[PDB]
Amino acid sequence: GPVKLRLTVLCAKNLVKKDFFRLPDPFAKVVVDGSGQCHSTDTVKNTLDPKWNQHYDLYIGKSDSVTISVWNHKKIHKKQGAGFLGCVRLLSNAINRLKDTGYQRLDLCKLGPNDNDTVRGQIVVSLQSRD
């Protein structure tokens, strides 16, 4: 059957303040492409270096993958594409090698070029499978 993997979102670095003189409110939201399983970490009020020390227990089967995406609560409310921070994506092969590593630093950047490049952050996590 599937394998439960715990992706621990330790903290995030260089939180794009987005709007000058203003501050973002980072929070995490994971999605499972194949199970519809979603999870989320509390929001961090006006910060440039948040942390949640919280993990998500997703599942992986054969060729499954999981993506932990962070969003700026302030702009998610702003609407109109506003609200994105840094989406981190790990595949099945990456999930395994990492599941034992115990730590991974994924830079929080935009989905891609010409696609709202309002990023500049990073994020530290830890991959360990559940017994």
Side-chain angles (χ1 to χ4, degrees), residues 57-124:
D57 320 70
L58 309 311
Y59 311 112
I60 346 280
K62 180 65 211 299
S63 179
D64 195 82
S65 61
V66 176
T67 318
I68 280 202
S69 59
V70 181
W71 307 80
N72 266 151
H73 179 83
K74 256 258 282 293
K75 318 287 290 169
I76 73 171
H77 178 264
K78 175 62 66 188
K79 200 68 207 184
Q80 191 178 330
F84 181 77
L85 258 177
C87 74
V88 5
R89 200 164 186 163
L90 299 313
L91 301 191
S92 63
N93 57 90
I95 254 116
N96 172 32
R97 289 179 174 186
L98 278 50
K99 79 137 78 64
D100 183 275
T101 56
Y103 272 140
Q104 290 287 275
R105 295 198 187 182
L106 321 313
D107 321 88
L108 298 182
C109 300
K110 33 60 171 65
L111 291 306
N114 288 211
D115 188 82
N116 300 91
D117 54 277
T118 61
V119 293
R120 155 195 304 210
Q122 304 73 35
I123 207 167
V124 178

Side-chain angles (χ1 to χ4, degrees), residues 2-7 55-59 99-100 127-131:
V3 283
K4 191 170 65 179
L5 175 279
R6 296 185 301 202
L7 178 36
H55 46 86
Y56 303 146
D57 320 70
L58 309 311
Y59 311 112
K99 79 137 78 64
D100 183 275
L127 285 296
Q128 195 197 330
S129 56
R130 235 295 178 195
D131 299 84

